[PDB]
Amino acid sequence: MREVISIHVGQAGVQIGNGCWELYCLEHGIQPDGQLPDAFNTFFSETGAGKHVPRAVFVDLEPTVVDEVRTGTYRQLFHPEQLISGKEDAANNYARGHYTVGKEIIDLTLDRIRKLADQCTGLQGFLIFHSFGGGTGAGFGSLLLERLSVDYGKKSKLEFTVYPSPQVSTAIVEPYNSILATHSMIDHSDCAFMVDNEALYDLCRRALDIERPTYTNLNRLIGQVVSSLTASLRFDGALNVDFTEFQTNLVPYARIHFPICSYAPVISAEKAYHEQLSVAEITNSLFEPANMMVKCDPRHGKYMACTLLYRGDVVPKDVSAAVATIKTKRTIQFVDWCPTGFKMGINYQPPTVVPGGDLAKVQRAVCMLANTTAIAEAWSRLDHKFDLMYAKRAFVHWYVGEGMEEAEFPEAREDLALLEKDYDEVAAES
């Protein structure tokens, strides 16, 4: 029918994927084994009898995270070939995960993803997960996109990546790894979405009253966006949005593709008791800087085209009125070569409520994908961090030792400079 392939790279990818496939199996009604006690085929293959197998490939250069699943409850769910593990991790070193370690396992990875695609008669895109600071997320992720571009060409390659936070940081060499990977992403990726832990932490504490979140809580929120993103191909509605529609509607140019995400409503059970949460309220909550999953103020820049997705008993009359209201906010700035400004989407399947969840049952929910020039702030933040280290050659010896050539460091600095120029040039006056 219509299909999409999910690939998880590094700890931050596979750990999110564990929560995602929990939500998807529960939504469709498939037990963790893969049997039953529809849209199954867009995510799963039916091996026969009554068993289902997901379309996922788990990859990391160290076996600890994958062996958790292999020993976990879901071990029978997956194909053992899908679960791919290396021997020793990349040690947060881009050169180590791209030149030395990455190339030993890349061809094994490409066979299984290509073998998985043969069974997919009507495949229409890929979903790939990174963390920018990781060696495997960046070093191995770059090598994977480069090969898939020639392997599959004009197939939409969508990415869901964790953006390095402004102040929260767990890797010291983190700015070095992001810039080198950014060069490979910018040419090959069709569109790559941004989320960051720092904003999700604050959102998980304010809107949801979870004072002290873990990585587990944040993975469920990301799972709901992908569920809402892919729900148009699965369940019935009134305005269907395919993957290819995202590629044309969101990005005006080739190098300005990076969007940001938002979701509404996110509310605890004891707050939703007092709130109706109709169409007007959920539309307004999206555009507050508090709800953005990337910690950048939209008021710093301007907005180009946005895409909105609704899941619930939503009537088209209310959708047009809410966006009409959104255009009346003078605190929201749009660019005048984007007077259209919007694409809408409506679907009837409500959000899925995982048992023991942190989310209240809401009857309609809206997801927002928006592209803005506010993220030019974030690149200038990351660019400055790189300069201080490289002025004194702070960590070059580790990279050079693992096959990396030093000449790529200024070239990667050059490409980011052009990307920074492209934003102010786009955001410039008509």
Binding site: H300, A376, E377, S380, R381, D383, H384, D387, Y390, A391, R393, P410, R413, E414, A417, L418, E420, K421, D424, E425
Partner: protein, 48 residues
């Protein structure tokens, strides 16, 4: 012992109160878009 000099403390207090230093300092923080090398090659690369 040397006696203190007579001083009109009310006049000095009258003058001093406008001069009281503020407790909390202000902070207008520059945005990184304002960087002097925005969209252009940093100068330190040639030395590197």
């Amino acid at each position: 012992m040397k006696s203190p000099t007579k001083h009109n403390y009310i006049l000095e207090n009258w003058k001093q109160a406008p001069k009281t230093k503020k407790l909390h300092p202000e902070k207008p923080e520059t945005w990184y878009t304002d960087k002097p090398e925005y969209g252009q090659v940093p100068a330190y690369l040639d030395r590197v």
